[PDB]
Amino acid sequence: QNITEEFYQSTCSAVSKGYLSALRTGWYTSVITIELSNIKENKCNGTDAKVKLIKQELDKYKNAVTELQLLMQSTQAFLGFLLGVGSAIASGVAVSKVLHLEGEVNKIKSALLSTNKAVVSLSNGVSVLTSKVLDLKNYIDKQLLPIVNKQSCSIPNIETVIEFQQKNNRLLEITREFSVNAGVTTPVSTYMLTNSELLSLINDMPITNDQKKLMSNNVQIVRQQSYSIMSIIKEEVLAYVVQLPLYGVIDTPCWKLHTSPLCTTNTKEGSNICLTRTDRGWYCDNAGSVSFFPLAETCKVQSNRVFCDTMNSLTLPSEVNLCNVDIFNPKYDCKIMTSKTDVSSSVITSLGAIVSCYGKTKCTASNKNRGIIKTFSNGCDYVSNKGVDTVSVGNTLYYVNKQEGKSLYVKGEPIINFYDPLVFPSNLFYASISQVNEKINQSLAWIRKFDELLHNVNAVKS
Amino acid sequence: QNITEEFYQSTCSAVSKGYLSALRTGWYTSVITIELSNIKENKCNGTDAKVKLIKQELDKYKNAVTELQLLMQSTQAFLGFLLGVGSAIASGVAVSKVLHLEGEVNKIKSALLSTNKAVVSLSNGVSVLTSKVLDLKNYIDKQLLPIVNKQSCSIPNIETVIEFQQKNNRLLEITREFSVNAGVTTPVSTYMLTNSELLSLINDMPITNDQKKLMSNNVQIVRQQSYSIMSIIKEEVLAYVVQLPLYGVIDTPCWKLHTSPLCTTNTKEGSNICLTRTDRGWYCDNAGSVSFFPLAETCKVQSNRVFCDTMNSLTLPSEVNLCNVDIFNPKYDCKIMTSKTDVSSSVITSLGAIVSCYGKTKCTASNKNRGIIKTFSNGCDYVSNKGVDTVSVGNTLYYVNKQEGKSLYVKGEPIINFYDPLVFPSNLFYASISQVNEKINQSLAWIRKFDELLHNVNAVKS
Amino acid sequence: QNITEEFYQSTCSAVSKGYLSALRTGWYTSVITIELSNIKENKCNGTDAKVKLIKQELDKYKNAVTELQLLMQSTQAFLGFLLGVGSAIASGVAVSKVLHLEGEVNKIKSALLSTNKAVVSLSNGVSVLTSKVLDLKNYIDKQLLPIVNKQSCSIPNIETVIEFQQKNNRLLEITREFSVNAGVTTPVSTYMLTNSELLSLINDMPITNDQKKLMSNNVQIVRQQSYSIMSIIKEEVLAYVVQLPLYGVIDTPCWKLHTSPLCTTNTKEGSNICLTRTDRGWYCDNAGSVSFFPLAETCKVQSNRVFCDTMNSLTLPSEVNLCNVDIFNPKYDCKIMTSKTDVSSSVITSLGAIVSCYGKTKCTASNKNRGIIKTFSNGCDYVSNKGVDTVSVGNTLYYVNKQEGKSLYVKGEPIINFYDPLVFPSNLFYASISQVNEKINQSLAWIRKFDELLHNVNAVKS
Ligand SMILES: *[C@@H]1O[C@H](CO)[C@@H](O)[C@H](O)[C@H]1NC(C)=O
Ligand SMILES: *[C@@H]1O[C@H](CO)[C@@H](O)[C@H](O)[C@H]1NC(C)=O
Ligand SMILES: *[C@@H]1O[C@H](CO)[C@@H](O)[C@H](O)[C@H]1NC(C)=O
Ligand SMILES: *[C@@H]1O[C@H](CO)[C@@H](O)[C@H](O)[C@H]1NC(C)=O
Ligand SMILES: *[C@@H]1O[C@H](CO)[C@@H](O)[C@H](O)[C@H]1NC(C)=O
Ligand SMILES: *[C@@H]1O[C@H](CO)[C@@H](O)[C@H](O)[C@H]1NC(C)=O
């Protein structure tokens, strides 16, 4: 853990380096089966309460099975706008659709006749891993049928009721979780796949030992980037499909960019111009190029490790890293946006905070022991979380992050002081440096042409 | 199931036809009641464990009732921006507010004195359907009071504890689900309304048989577009309001539009212009006009049937369908947006995928048996899911949808090759064809006027 | 409850006054502890079913503890774009990180040796409130060990199994809720903090009596603006951190602004200009200034009281209230946006509805007794919820809110009739009154200069 952070005063932005990558670059699909029963009907002219409880539990089981069948017979009769779209569950749904052909269920049942785990080939020629996580058929047919199938339902025992309830609870919960999500669920609960079974699926994937260890250590995130799909219920067997991620890129450098608006500080109201850098997010080296994640909601962090998803990313060249040290470079075209609004805000970075204090707003950073230790002036400034606990930007109070690290301050004149406020192209959402430069150079051309003609007409007088 | 898809090369967009509509055009409200008890106090100088368990369950019941009373005494002392706003629970909240007038609870209790279902008229003159889904009062008053009301609490039986737990669990879950949602819940769980009661409410609505059948078959979606509202707890009765949808438009044609950016392929960096069609979403014929759903999150699909919601829609004329066959028609004004960014992406359609490959990005589509089967050039292209499993657009891998259907390819020169790159109005977010045409015709007017004057001054020399 | 609403016809917007404020201006953190056990191993050569049930429950407990340890050893090896960013759980995470130093667990255990509540000082010098909400150690070590530690596991009793299940359920649920949320949860469930313990924490905060009463009455919202953070599991004790809000500003006036587009009604298609007010949200007086909440998802309402959050707000001067009575005031610069789209929509306010009816759309408001009672013309209009139940704007049907109040109608000519349609700066997303005025005054300057030169050249002929 050697996270470092730099502040660039010339553009009012910060970069945090020192992380490691774990990117998702594929999917893995398996099949999970449950062996049910087909209890026909229960009939007793009894009066004991234990028989009543047994009948109630059996009724709940039948209702769950019927609801599952009914559900099955319904499916088969700033730069966030630059991203393409895709379907997240295409592979699992394809496997589920393959499962509906005739003879597949017989193949699955024949494969797992003796053992609880096997590898079977489907019709099209794909091999998937199967499992049998529960078996209610044997217990029901060997315990409950002798009590209630033909006899007068004489005497169940008190322990049998509790045992049956404990057995049936998991199936009830699985039915409940499929029911409300219309078939496809979000992070796979403990009922769908036990923590002792997730660690067993991982030790069967065709991956390297390092990826196996990474998936085993951080198992609470593999569970948050997975899907579960209901497939079929027929011929006394239940089957659903689990879709697990694959991490093909591991241990490559990553960094994050924090940006804030940078304005001018003229006293006259409504006489200030601003610009802001719009490309803020996560960047990670990936096979000779940089991947950009702008949604700020697809990447998780565990203290040095970032678990991103490559379906909501952009592939940029390796020169995108050069916008930091220099902004007027003739090799990349950094992205900005312009406006004319002067409002104070603050951005809480990983190792400090950025404060923009424009207008008459009072901005202050305070320590918890002495009290007030800094009074910001008008501009973009940055303070580190070493002796600072909270920062206030007016009516708002923020708490800074207290991670240990090293922060550096880079001086330099702001770039907003180089432009001409009489020709600046305001209200230019999602512009770039070259576009802004082009829009300015041509207005002066019109002005000069006008001046030329005006001089010329006063030259031809005589 | 006869879904069809077309690709229009001239605008880099695709249309998928063949669906059917089921639109929500109203609400239906009912009342669900529960009959509670008013156990005052329990006192025993006992030592048996069964008495302890009974007391614990009674304490949980009292705590749930108290929490419900406390909650009740708190409420009564791209084109996604074009949509208006509305309140989703106005009708249910209105009914709940009507329920608070004096004498309403007496009317409800008198209506359901003997049967479990009745129709009653409130004060203002509206008739609603009531129900009684649970009755703990009779069981408690006829079983638990003889054990603990006055006596020394001699001997409960072991089965009674389990029976009471099973009875009380549902009320505990209902209290839990109201507690965390502040009164109004999202898709109605199995505890609020049993699957055997939802199918009974549907057979009492004033609707046609076809709508009844549609609601009965797809019951997992009627449950996802419904609300539950806590109303009152007083005079030993609990009542909450359920708000069910109504589907007034059924079996009308629908289709979806997929759009992707279309750019120019000049070699020089920063010398390309782009435009994109911004109106992508679901369209459905509705009584002589087309309804547009741009949020891309309000419509569900079950293999040919689309369950949309009409509160987040727009009403467009019937000529909006004409932007597909022609884009320069003098009857509608299709909506576009312009920029100057050249980044590669991909859009996964229903029966294929659209690939945009600009710059130095390597784009490829691969089959799972042979391997690589296509290498895209620079431009907008489209490939169908017949012999293609995955497509990669650089560092990203996508899985195409494997639905069966028929796809067609329509040729034609791209429209971006007709414009003049010296006067093209870039950075024009949310423009239209006529606006872009107007902004170009007037710059040439200024240029021609300038040329006219410049020639004229050199005509008056002598 | 004296809510009032006004409609300003000149700008097609409405204001609803009469509310009260309860703003969050800080955090409060406490520690919740659970006393576990360290059962080593269970071994019985038994055959009774009760022993089997006991062993199963013990196995579940061990699995929960192991999963918790594994999770712990993973974290330590329109104007919505104007808002700054911040970290919501900085304080709780800081306290959790402080908890990991050596000797802290010993201090916590020594503080709560005898009582269930104490105040203890950590290493850095901060005092926090601790608690002991559950004790499984004593029950396990005094009941289950005599049954299964060394003996042949002779006879458990039937009531012991149920008692142990009831004890263990809460720990199982806590483990389940941490497991799927990766450590940090959203609104604190009933398992993490009992409703009888939340009301006990509130009576220990260093706050005034009025804030205590406000927090006690509306306890279902204090629970929705809180976080729970997993911290540690070691040395036979479990500890997690709860982060509760603080309400520093209470009983200050608030109001809401509703805005809708305002267009021109020329008959020719594609010849209309529009403008819309973009600053819609909640405003609340706060210490000599107004706080603006634009996200429309951070503020809740209970019939006169608004529970907002100050982390997603903006601090504006006190002159922002002046845009309502007048829009051309020389003291503030109200924010608008321009376009050229004519589409009909509707905005449902608190005491009525705003209807915009442009083009050939049919807009109508209907009562539930007579039927149709109003037919809107082309323009922006407003109708109150007194004799009106629903309003339709085409293919869409809306339900108005039926709250009691007083509404007022303010006449005045629309401002869109003052501009010149030949120089109006369309497609100017997020503009302002002064910017639009500036962009118009300078085009006329160019036209006049052109005319001047053209006259001048025809003056020098001879
Ligand atoms: C991290 O920095 C520390 C300095 O305290 C030192 O151990 C070394 O430079 C780095 N350790 C690594 C990269 O393992
Ligand atoms: C000046 O005009 C040239 C075209 O001749 C253009 O390429 C350039 O971007 C403009 N601005 C500057 C600063 O050179
Ligand atoms: C759907 O297409 C098939 C062609 O395979 C044929 O049955 C018919 O054209 C269509 N059936 C319908 C619309 O029911
Ligand atoms: C040309 O100018 C006319 C106005 O005289 C305008 O209506 C039209 O949109 C412009 N462009 C074209 C292609 O006609
Ligand atoms: C609210 O209005 C009512 C009028 O019916 C009246 O009691 C008084 O003006 C107000 N009451 C308050 C503010 O307590
Ligand atoms: C007119 O031009 C002046 C600059 O001389 C500018 O300040 C003003 O905003 C423009 N418009 C009006 C209506 O005065």
Automatic annotation (TrEMBL), chains A, B, C:
Cellular component aspect of the GO annotation:
host cell Golgi membrane; host cell plasma membrane; viral envelope; virion membrane
Q: Does the keyword rRNA-binding apply?
A: no
User: What GO biological process terms does the UniProt entry carry, in alphabetical order?
Assistant: entry receptor-mediated virion attachment to host cell; fusion of virus membrane with host plasma membrane; symbiont entry into host cell; symbiont-mediated induction of syncytium formation
Q: How does it sit in the membrane?
A: Single-pass membrane protein; Single-pass type I membrane protein
| Recorded coiled-coil stretches | 51-77
Pfam families from the UniProt entry: Fusion_gly (PF00523)
Signal peptide from the UniProt entry: none
Arranged from A to Z, the UniProt key words for this protein are: Cleavage on pair of basic residues, Coiled coil, Disulfide bond, Fusion of virus membrane with host cell membrane, Fusion of virus membrane with host membrane, Glycoprotein, Host cell membrane, Host Golgi apparatus, Host membrane, Host-virus interaction, Lipoprotein, Membrane, Palmitate, Signal, Syncytium formation induced by viral infection, Transmembrane, Transmembrane helix, Viral attachment to host cell, Viral attachment to host entry receptor, Viral envelope protein, Viral penetration into host cytoplasm, Virion, Virus entry into host cell
* Subcellular localization: Host Golgi apparatus membrane; Host cell membrane; Virion membrane
Tell me how this protein assembles: Homotrimer. Heterodimer with fusion protein F2; disulfide-linked. Interacts with host NCL; this interaction plays a role in viral entry into the host cell. As a heterodimer with F2, interacts with host heparan sulfate. As a heterodimer with F2, interacts with host IGF1R; this interaction activates PRKCZ/PKCzeta that recruits NCL/nucleolin from the host nucleus to the plasma membrane. Part of a complex composed of F1, F2 and G glycoproteins. As a heterodimer with F2, interacts with host RHOA; this interaction facilitates virus-induced syncytium formation.
Report the family membership: Belongs to the paramyxoviruses fusion glycoprotein family.
Please give the function described in this protein's UniProt entry. Answer: Major determinant of the species specificity of RSV infection. The trimer of F1-F2 (F protein) also facilitates the attachment to host cell by binding to host heparan sulfate. F protein is involved in the entry into the host cell through the interaction with host IGF1R. This interaction activates PRKCZ/PKCzeta that recruits host NCL/nucleolin to the apical cell surface where it can bind fusion glycoprotein F1. Inactive precursor that is cleaved at two sites by a furin-like protease to give rise to the mature F1 and F2 fusion glycoproteins.
Name used for this protein in its record: Fusion glycoprotein F0
The source organism is Human respiratory syncytial virus
Q: Which gene encodes it?
A: F
